[PDB]
Design an enzyme around this catalytic site. Structure first.
Site, PDB file in Angstrom:
ATOM      1  N   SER A  83      40.520 -69.110 -82.968  1.00 19.43           N
ATOM      2  CA  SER A  83      39.171 -69.462 -83.464  1.00 19.43           C
ATOM      3  C   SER A  83      39.091 -70.982 -83.783  1.00 19.43           C
ATOM      4  O   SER A  83      39.179 -71.758 -82.848  1.00 19.43           O
ATOM      5  CB  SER A  83      38.820 -68.584 -84.672  1.00 19.43           C
ATOM      6  OG  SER A  83      37.428 -68.571 -84.912  1.00 19.43           O
ATOM      7  N   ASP A 118      40.591 -66.787 -78.584  1.00 20.18           N
ATOM      8  CA  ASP A 118      39.175 -66.727 -78.947  1.00 20.18           C
ATOM      9  C   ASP A 118      38.746 -68.044 -79.607  1.00 20.18           C
ATOM     10  O   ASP A 118      38.262 -68.035 -80.734  1.00 20.18           O
ATOM     11  CB  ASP A 118      38.873 -65.511 -79.879  1.00 20.18           C
ATOM     12  CG  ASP A 118      37.707 -64.676 -79.386  1.00 20.18           C
ATOM     13  OD1 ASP A 118      37.281 -64.884 -78.237  1.00 20.18           O
ATOM     14  OD2 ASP A 118      37.263 -63.759 -80.132  1.00 20.18           O
ATOM     15  N   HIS A 177      36.545 -60.564 -82.355  1.00 15.75           N
ATOM     16  CA  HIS A 177      37.161 -61.774 -82.872  1.00 15.75           C
ATOM     17  C   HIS A 177      38.391 -61.460 -83.740  1.00 15.75           C
ATOM     18  O   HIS A 177      39.423 -62.122 -83.624  1.00 15.75           O
ATOM     19  CB  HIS A 177      36.124 -62.605 -83.678  1.00 15.75           C
ATOM     20  CG  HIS A 177      36.453 -64.064 -83.775  1.00 15.75           C
ATOM     21  ND1 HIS A 177      36.771 -64.819 -82.638  1.00 15.75           N
ATOM     22  CD2 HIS A 177      36.481 -64.876 -84.867  1.00 15.75           C
ATOM     23  CE1 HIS A 177      36.977 -66.053 -83.073  1.00 15.75           C
ATOM     24  NE2 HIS A 177      36.807 -66.133 -84.408  1.00 15.75           N
TER      25      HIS A 177
HETATM   26  C1  6HU Z   1      42.105 -64.142 -90.361  1.00 14.51           C
HETATM   27  O1  6HU Z   1      41.052 -64.883 -90.978  1.00 14.51           O
HETATM   28  C2  6HU Z   1      39.792 -64.779 -90.301  1.00 14.51           C
HETATM   29  C3  6HU Z   1      39.758 -65.816 -89.168  1.00 14.51           C
HETATM   30  O2  6HU Z   1      38.723 -65.541 -88.234  1.00 14.51           O
HETATM   31  C4  6HU Z   1      38.707 -65.019 -91.355  1.00 14.51           C
HETATM   32  N1  6HU Z   1      38.535 -63.894 -92.267  1.00 14.51           N
HETATM   33  C5  6HU Z   1      38.825 -63.844 -93.578  1.00 14.51           C
HETATM   34  C6  6HU Z   1      38.488 -62.606 -94.018  1.00 14.51           C
HETATM   35  C7  6HU Z   1      37.979 -61.948 -92.915  1.00 14.51           C
HETATM   36  N2  6HU Z   1      37.516 -60.633 -92.837  1.00 14.51           N
HETATM   37  C8  6HU Z   1      37.632 -59.605 -93.787  1.00 14.51           C
HETATM   38  C9  6HU Z   1      38.796 -59.407 -94.514  1.00 14.51           C
HETATM   39  C10 6HU Z   1      38.913 -58.380 -95.451  1.00 14.51           C
HETATM   40  C11 6HU Z   1      40.217 -58.247 -96.162  1.00 14.51           C
HETATM   41  C12 6HU Z   1      40.533 -59.146 -97.176  1.00 14.51           C
HETATM   42  C13 6HU Z   1      41.736 -59.062 -97.835  1.00 14.51           C
HETATM   43  C14 6HU Z   1      42.642 -58.091 -97.498  1.00 14.51           C
HETATM   44  C15 6HU Z   1      42.354 -57.190 -96.498  1.00 14.51           C
HETATM   45  C16 6HU Z   1      41.144 -57.246 -95.817  1.00 14.51           C
HETATM   46  C17 6HU Z   1      40.877 -56.259 -94.708  1.00 14.51           C
HETATM   47  C18 6HU Z   1      37.843 -57.488 -95.647  1.00 14.51           C
HETATM   48  C19 6HU Z   1      37.908 -56.358 -96.643  1.00 14.51           C
HETATM   49  C20 6HU Z   1      36.680 -57.676 -94.912  1.00 14.51           C
HETATM   50  C21 6HU Z   1      36.566 -58.704 -93.987  1.00 14.51           C
HETATM   51  O3  6HU Z   1      35.455 -58.945 -93.227  1.00 14.51           O
HETATM   52  C22 6HU Z   1      34.235 -58.283 -93.579  1.00 14.51           C
HETATM   53  C23 6HU Z   1      33.112 -58.957 -92.822  1.00 14.51           C
HETATM   54  N3  6HU Z   1      33.171 -58.621 -91.378  1.00 14.51           N
HETATM   55  N4  6HU Z   1      38.007 -62.722 -91.833  1.00 14.51           N
HETATM   56 CL    CL Z   2      33.236 -60.456 -82.682  1.00 16.30          CL
END
Ligand code: 6HU
Ligand code: CL
Ligand code: CL
Length: 371
Positions: free
Chosen positions: A219, A242, A297
């Site tokens: 990214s 990506d 992504h």
């Molecule tokens: C790898 O970094 C990406 C680079 O592209 C950016 N990034 C940061 C956080 C995220 N996504 C995301 C993470 C989590 C999460 C947080 C902590 C532990 C476990 C989880 C699973 C949750 C619940 C929800 C999340 O997204 C909800 C909207 N779609 N992406």
């Molecule tokens: Cl996507």
């Protein structure tokens, strides 16, 4: 579960910070390990990373405490502080994380590359694109472990062009600096890790195959791949996972002599982004591009392994494709590309077909129509 790695090598993990300042290098190292009986590696090691993640996701910092409750004890299958497997020089990957990420969130990739005989330096960026990062104000603070935290910067729309480009340029400098640090450790320079960890950096002396260097990133980190290649000819090839192309300056596109591989998800990509990738193409230059069918992504990062299938799809952490199937394709195609352009004497050419997108779950090139 984050998968254990497909290669024949056991995998170790440690952290390196040198120097201790906000201008020093901070990286997570994955490496072929001598032993396979250590504690597994804590995946997200500090509460402040959860606060950073909650800010990136647009919630109150208190959601950070709930994420820490749900995920704060999760491990990744790498032997923490295991001795380096001796007797072989290892090729080097420098790894660049995405926007809102940090150094520990691409362990499925880092572990798999290490299981195949790579050393992986996953850099933590101090450009304020990480959800959170830390450093020490001075030598006193470093000694007593008094961490200063630096959180994700949010931008107004008018700041986007200029600040994303300042950031991608700092990210490239950080990749180059991390390379020079590892090479100096390989060439025997005494380095005192600012982190007090039970992994002696002297093990890394004479352990890097010094001409076999690649840069890989997801990214924002995919744009970091390209800026880094254009600026630092010590990197021999790059793999953009990506890539988010927006941060790159107009000047970089004609300035990438090294082989470059684009590995895309199906659902992330869009014409403006594909047009910028095609701008990297030139008849004299080695370029390859594949798209993983049914992928998103988040298939390139560890969050795709962090929840079940249904919650995963809802949170857009998973695609239609199985997460293990998608990451195997990205990692195996990566291994074959690295073998080709680093000149490795391994068996990674068994996946040459994947570089060309010849698989039921691969699209050659892109599904995205431009012009
Ligand atoms: C790898 O970094 C990406 C680079 O592209 C950016 N990034 C940061 C956080 C995220 N996504 C995301 C993470 C989590 C999460 C947080 C902590 C532990 C476990 C989880 C699973 C949750 C619940 C929800 C999340 O997204 C909800 C909207 N779609 N992406
Ligand atoms: Cl996507
Ligand atoms: Cl577009």
């Amino acid at each position: 579960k984050i998968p254990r790695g497909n290669g024949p090598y056991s995998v170790g993990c440690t952290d390196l910070m040198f120097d201790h300042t906000n201008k020093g290098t901070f990286l997570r190292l994955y490496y072929p390990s001598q032993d396979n009986d250590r504690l597994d590696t804590l995946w997200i090691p500090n509460k402040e990373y959860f606060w950073g993640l909650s800010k990136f996701l647009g919630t109150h910092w208190l959601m950070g405490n709930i994420l820490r409750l749900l995920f704060g004890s999760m491990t990744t299958p790498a032997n923490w502080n295991s001795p380096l497997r001796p007797g072989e020089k290892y090729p080097l990957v420098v790894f660049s994380h995405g926007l809102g990420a940090f150094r520990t969130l691409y362990s499925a990739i880092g572990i798999d590359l290490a299981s195949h005989g790579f050393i992986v330096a996953a850099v933590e960026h101090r450009d304020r694109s990480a959800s959170a990062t830390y450093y020490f104000k001075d030598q006193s603070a470093a000694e007593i472990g008094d961490k200063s935290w630096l959180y994700l910067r949010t931008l107004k729309q008018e700041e986007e062009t200029h600040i994303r480009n300042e950031q991608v340029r700092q990210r490239a400098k950080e990749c180059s600096q991390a390379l020079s640090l590892i090479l100096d450790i390989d060439h025997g320079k005494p380095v005192k890790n600012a982190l007090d960890l039970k992994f002696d950096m002297e093990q890394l002396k004479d352990s890097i195959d010094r001409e076999k260097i690649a840069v890989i990133g997801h990214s924002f980190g995919g744009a970091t791949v390209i800026q880094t290649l254009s600026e630092d000819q010590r990197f021999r090839c790059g793999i953009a996972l990506d890539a988010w192309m927006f941060p790159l300056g107009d000047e970089v596109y004609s300035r990438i002599p090294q082989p470059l591989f684009f590995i895309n998800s199906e659902y992330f990509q869009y014409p403006a982004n594909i047009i910028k990738m095609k701008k990297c193409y030139s008849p004299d230059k080695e370029r390859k591009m594949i798209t993983i069918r049914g992928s998103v992504h988040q298939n390139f990062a560890d969050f795709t392994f962090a929840t079940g299938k249904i919650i995963g799809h809802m949170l857009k952490l998973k695609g239609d494709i199985d997460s293990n199937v998608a990451i195997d394709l990205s990692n195996k195609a990566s291994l074959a590309f690295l073998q080709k352009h680093l000149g490795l004497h391994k068996d990674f050419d068994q996946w040459d077909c994947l570089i060309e997108g010849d698989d039921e779950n691969l699209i050659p090139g892109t599904n995205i129509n431009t012009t």
